[PDB]
Amino acid sequence: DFPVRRTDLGQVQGLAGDVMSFRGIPYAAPPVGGLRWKPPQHARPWAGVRPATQFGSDCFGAAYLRKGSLAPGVSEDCLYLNVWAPSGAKPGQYPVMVWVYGGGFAGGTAAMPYYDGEALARQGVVVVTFNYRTNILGFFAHPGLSRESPTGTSGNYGLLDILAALRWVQSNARAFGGDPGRVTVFGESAGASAIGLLLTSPLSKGLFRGAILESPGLTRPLATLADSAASGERLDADLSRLRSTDPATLMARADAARPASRDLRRPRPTGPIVDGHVLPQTDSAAIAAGQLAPVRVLIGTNADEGRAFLGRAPMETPADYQAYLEAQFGDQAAAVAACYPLDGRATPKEMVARIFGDNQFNRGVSAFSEALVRQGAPVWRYQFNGNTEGGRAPATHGAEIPYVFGVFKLDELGLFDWPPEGPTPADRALGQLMSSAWVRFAKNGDPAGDALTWPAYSTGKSTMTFGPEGRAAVVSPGPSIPPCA
Template sequence: MVLASIFVAAVLIMTPSEAGPSNPRVAVEQGELVGRRDGTVVSFKGVPYAAPPVGPLRWRRPHPAASWRGPRDAGQVGAICIQPPSGGDPGVGPLPMSEDCLTLNVWTPADRAGPRPVMVWIHGGGFNNGSGTAALYDGTNLARRGVVVVTINYRLGRLGFFDHPALAAEREQGEPAANYGMMDIVAALKWVRDNAAAFGGDAGNVTVFGESAGGAAVTRLMISPEARGLFHRAVVQSGLGRDSGVPLDAPSAIGGPSLRDRGAAFARTVGATTAEALRALPAEALLNPAPNFYGGDNLVVDGQLVTEDVEAAFAAGREAPVPLIIGTNSAEFWWIRPQEISPYGAIDDALTSQERVDLYAAYGGEDGYRAHVVSDLAFNEPARHLARLHARNGHPTYLYRFDVVPDSNPEPSGGATHASERPYVFDNLHTVGRPMGERDDRAARAMADYWTRFATRGDPNGEGLPIWPGFGAERDRLLEFTNDGPVAKAIPFADRLDLIEAYYARVR
C-alpha cells in the first residue's frame, strides 16, 4: 500500500494533463500548481510542503520539498500518513496511506483579491490518527467567508514522535529530535509564510486552529521558539492544557520512562536494535501496540522545539502574545470513568480523601462525579486555567463552551461529546452522516462566522451575532454555543472547577 501510494503521487507530478487549461493556476516556490474551481472558491490539493520522510529521512527533521518542472495537478488530496484503522472517525480521510504524506490543501476565494487572512487547521486524533484530507475539513465554506484555508498532514504515532539510543547516536550536535510531527507542523507554517501571497493570503495574518491533539499542537506552537512569528492568532478546541510532556532522556514529570527508553523498549519487541534496522522496518510494524497520547509517548518535551510544559510556560508569560480562542465541549469524555486503568483514569488518583468527598458533593454524588470528572480534569478546568493566564498576561482571550446536540445524536452523552464541534466550525454538517436540523445550520453558521471574524482581526465579534465577552474584560465569562444559539454567561459548574484547580495547585 505504501509503495503504491508513492507511485501514484509520482504519476500525478508527471501527468498533469487531466488539469485542463481553464483550471486555476498558481506559482509557488517549487513550481506551478493546477487547481480546481467550485463556484466562488478555488482549491489546490495534495501540495508537498516537505520532502517525503522515507528511507534515510525517516526520523529526521523535515527537508524542503523538491521543485518540479511544468504544471503539477493539484486536483486530488495526497495520501494520509501511516496510522491504525480509524474506527469510523470522519476526521481521518480516504486511503491510500503512505509515509510520503507531507502535503497540504488550500482553499481560497476565486477572485484572489488580497491580502486575506489565512487559517491553518491542525487535525486531532491523539497524534496517532487523522489527516487534513477528510471531507469534514474541506475549507470551501470557510473560504466563502473571505479567508484562505490550509489543512495539513503531519507524521503520526512512532513515525512522528519517537526516539531510540541508536537514533540519538547518529544525530549531529544540535539536530532536533523525536518531535517530528511537531516539526512537520512548523515546516508547513513556514511554507505558508513563504507562499501565502500566491493564493491571495496575508502571511502577516495567520491563524492556527486545531482540535484535541491539534489543539494541544496549537498550545505547543504558542510556547515554541521555533514557531514564534509564524502565526498571529490561535484557536484551541479541546486541547488539554495541564498535560505533562515526556523528555527525551529523563523521566516525565508524572513518572514513567524517558521517550528514548520507551523507544528502546518498543524496538526490542520487533527485534530492531540499530538505526539501520529501525529504518528498514515496514511502517505498519510501528503501529502495534499503539503509542499513548495523554501522559505517554506522543507529547514530547524535546528541548528544542518544545522546551517545557504548556502550563508552566503560560504561567511564566512565555507564550506567544497573540489573541486566543480556547474552549471545550460540554460532555467531552463522557464515556471514560475515573476508575478505569488508563492515563485518563489515573488523573484523579492523587486526590486526598477530603478532596474526593468535596468533589462528590460538588457533582451531586458519586455517579455525577464518575460521569463528568475526567472531562473537567482533562479539558474544562485546564481551558479555564490557560484562559486566565493568557488574559492575565495582557493578551486578548475568548473562552467558549460548546453544548449543541442534534436531535439525531445517538449517544447518551448528556451533552456535546469530544470532537462534535468540528463540522460546525467548518460549516460542513453534511459530512457527519446523519440528519441535521435548522438549529444545527444556525449553530454552524454562527460558529464559522465567529472563527473567521477572529481570523480577520483577532476579535470574533461582529454585526449580527451575540457579543462574545473578552475573558480579561469580563472575568470568568464565556460564550456558550447552545441549541437555542450562542449565549454569554458565567462559566458553568465553576464550583467543580475551583476544587479541581485547588487539587492541581497542591499536586503540582
C-alpha cells in the same frame, strides 16, 4: 481565473469553482528512509504544472482515526497540504486559516469530508488543511536520533511538521490569495493541543497572529527526552534496524504495546515530549514563567468532554464507580469521591465523564486562559453546549467541528449528534453564528460582530456559551472546575 497557482516549488493545478480547491501539495520532502525521524526537509522544485486535484496519502496512524478518509491510501510519503480560496482572490487579499486536526497524536487525516474548507473559504478566507506525522513515526525518541541531531535532541517530529506547514503558508499564501500577516492557526483536540504547546515554543515565532484552540488537552503529563529516548532504545537499540523496518510493521508493533485503559497520570503512549528544542519545558512550567506567545487566542471547550472517552468497562453501580476511583487514584479515591460524589445528582458514567473532562481538558483550558490574560494577550473563551432543546445530550468531544466548518456530515466515530434526517434549523443557525465568529476572528482578530457581543475573557472571565436553540450568550464569570480538583 484558472485553477493554476505558482507555489515557491512550482505550479499546481486544482479544481475550479466559486471556491478554488487544491489538494495534495507537498510542503516538505518525503520523510522516508534516512529522513524518517528527521525534521521535515525542504521539498524539491518541479517543472510544469503538478497535479493537485487529489488528496495526497494519509500519514500512518490508528486505522479507526482515518475511517472515512477521502485520501487514496496511507504512506510515510504523506507531508501534503490542501488549499481552498475564493475564485479570483488577489495576492494578499484574504486572511488565512490553517487547520490542525486531532487524532490523539496517534492518527487522523485532513482528508475528512467534515474538514472540507469550501464553506469557510466562501466567507472570505484562504483555508489550509494538511497532514503531519503522528504515532511512532511522528513522536519517537532514541539515543541515536539525539546523537545524529543538529540540536542533540529527538522526538516531536509531528510538531516540526506543523511548523513546516506554517512556514509553507508564510511563503505561499499570497500566490493563493492569502495574507501571510493575517494567519490564524486553528485546530481541534490533539491539534488544538499541538497549537497550545507551540504557544510555548520559540520555534513558532512569526508563523501566525492568531490561534483558535478547540478542546485542547493541556497541562497534561509529558515525557522527558531522557525517558522517551530510553523507551525508544528499549524498542530496539540499533537505530539502523529501526529505520529499515517497514512502517506498517513498526506501527503495529508499537500499537500492540499501547495500554488498553487510559491512565490519567501517565504521558500519552505517543505524543509531544519535553525535547528541549521544540518544547524546552512542560507547558505548565512555561505557563508559570510566562513563556507564552501573547498572540490573539480563541479557546474553549464543549459541555461534556469526557463522555466520548468512557469506553466499555461496566459503569452502572456505585461499586463500579468506587472500583474506578480506586484503580485510578489509589489512596486519594476518597478525596476524589468527595470532589466528585455519587450523591444522586449524576450517574457513575456522568461522574467519570466529569472527572475525565476536567483532568484532560477543562483544567488546562482554565490554566491557559488565565495565563494568556496575565500576559496581556487578546484572549476569548467559549463553551459549546450544543442544541439540547429536543432532548439531545450536551455536546461531547468533537461535536463542534461541523458548526465551525459548515459541513454537516456524520463522522464515523459517532461523535457528531443530530437526527438522521439531518441537522435541525437550530443546528444550522448555530453553525452560521459560530462559523461567522471564527471567520471574524481570522479577519479582525476579534470574534465579536455587530450582532454578537463577545467581550474578551480578560473582562470578568466572560465566556461565550453556544447554548441551545441556535443561540449564543455571554456568561460572566464563565466555567470553573471545582476548587477541590
